[PDB]
Structure formats: C-alpha cells, structure tokens
C-alpha cells in the first residue's frame, strides 16, 4: 500500500476500535474513585466457585462479541473466507480482550473495573485460578506502564488479530498481505507520534499464547468439577471458542 492509503488505514482502524468498545475511556477514568468496599470484596469471595465462573464467562463473552464487531470492521477481514475468519477469531479474540483490558485497569492501585466498580485481584479468589488471575493482572500492569493511547491499542489489537502464522489458514498469503499493511499502519503511526520507543517494550511473542492456554486449562478443570454448570449456564459463544462447542 502507498502512503495516503496507510494513513487512511490508520484512521479506519482507530475509528473501528472506538466504535466497538462497550465503555468510553472517559467513562472508565471518571469511575476510578468508585472502589469496592472491604464488605463488597468479602461478598465476592463468599460466592460459590460456579457462580463466579458463570459471571466471569458472561462478561468475557460480552467482551468477545465486541471483538467480533471490531474484526468485521477491519478492511480485508470480511473479504477472507469464513474458515480463515473463524481461525483468526478463535485464536485471537481472547488475546484482543487481554490487551483491551489495560484500558479498564488502574495501575495506581492495581484494580480493574468489574461489575460497576474498581476492585483488586482478591475480588476473584472464589474462581480458584489464582495463578491465572495474577498473571492477567501482571500483564495489564506491564501494558499500563507503556502509557498506550487509544490509537496505539487500536493498531496493536488489529495486529494481534491479523496474524498470518495462525495454524489452519487456507489463504495464508492473503493474510500475510493484510498483516504487512497493518504493520505499516502501526509503525507509521508510531513514527509520526515519536513513539517508536514502545516497540522494544511490547509483550514477547508467546506471552499472550501462554495466558490463553492457561485460561483453557483452568476451564477444563472447572468443567470436570461442574460439567452441568458449563453445559446449562455458560454462553454458547464462550463454549464454541473455549470448549469446542
């Protein structure tokens, strides 16, 4: 792609990102002092493991629906065959959610916006996946230290999704070309805003895959203990992406 086309690509991705976020960044920032009390935290800690998993799977499913809408607005995504669209979303939707979540993370007090207020990782104790929760909090903390703009997250998440290395891609060369153009848009934007210093600080190739693999593993453990809860009370989209339907 030429220069004018790259700038158009940057504008298009940033607009697609802003239009596909449930909450405005300004809404999240204005809620920072709205923190769960010690009584409310104890309340979440006293919830049954199955109740907390159900609540978390519903919130993750809603976040994924927004990621699907984001993918659909990406130039070239809708021109790929359905097999490749599905391969990219199944491999990348959770990774996009993990990156987007730093917008709802307050590095000042290590809290996340969850169910209307900010709370620390202790809110999630009843899930019984402490190692995964602390790794997600560590990841959001590491991204927050980069001070990403909303435009930087938009371009980086388009790249998390448009990855030609995903196994199962039928039109690999077509995805390599969309990836190259998105990489140019991302690097052009960083060069234009004097933010190329972040390139070295972006998470390593393998960190997102590790977090996604841990999520799937913890789900399998929960599913063995509460199979009827997953079958009857988890969203169908969640099961499609994480437990093969």
């Amino acid at each position: 792609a030429s220069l004018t086309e790259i700038e158009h690509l940057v504008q298009s991705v940033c607009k697609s990102y802003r239009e596909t976020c449930q909450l405005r960044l300004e809404d999240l920032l204005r809620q920072r002092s709205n923190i769960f009390s010690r009584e409310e935290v104890t309340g979440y800690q006293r919830k049954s493991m199955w109740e907390m998993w159900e609540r978390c799977a519903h919130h993750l499913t809603e976040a994924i629906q927004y990621v699907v809408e984001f993918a659909k607005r990406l130039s070239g995504f809708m021109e790929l065959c359905q097999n490749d669209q599905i391969v990219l979303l199944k491999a990348g939707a959770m990774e996009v959610v993990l990156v987007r979540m730093c917008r709802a993370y307050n590095a000042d007090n290590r809290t996340v916006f969850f169910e209307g207020k900010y709370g620390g990782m202790e809110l999630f104790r009843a899930l019984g996946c402490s190692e995964l929760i602390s790794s997600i909090f560590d990841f959001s903390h590491s991204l927050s230290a980069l001070h990403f703009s909303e435009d930087e997250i938009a371009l980086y998440t388009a790249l998390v999704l448009i990855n030609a290395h995903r196994p199962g891609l039928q039109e690999k060369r077509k995805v390599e070309q969309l990836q190259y153009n998105l990489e140019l848009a991302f690097h052009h934007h960083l060069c234009k805003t004097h933010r190329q210093s972040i390139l070295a600080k972006l998470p390593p190739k393998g960190k997102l895959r590790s977090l996604c693999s841990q999520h799937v593993e913890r789900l399998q453990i929960f599913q063995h203990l509460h199979p009827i809860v997953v079958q009857a009370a988890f969203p169908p989209l969640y099961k499609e992406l994480f437990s093969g339907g």
Binding site: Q65, Q82, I86, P236, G245
Partner: peptide, 12 residues
C-alpha cells in the same frame, strides 16, 4: 459446529 460465530459473521 461454530454455530454462533458463523451467525455473528453472517449477521450484516
């Protein structure tokens, strides 16, 4: 198989 995703990608 992939019922929901197929519907979301078709739903225009």
């Amino acid at each position: 198989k992939h019922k929901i995703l197929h519907r979301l990608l078709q739903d225009s």
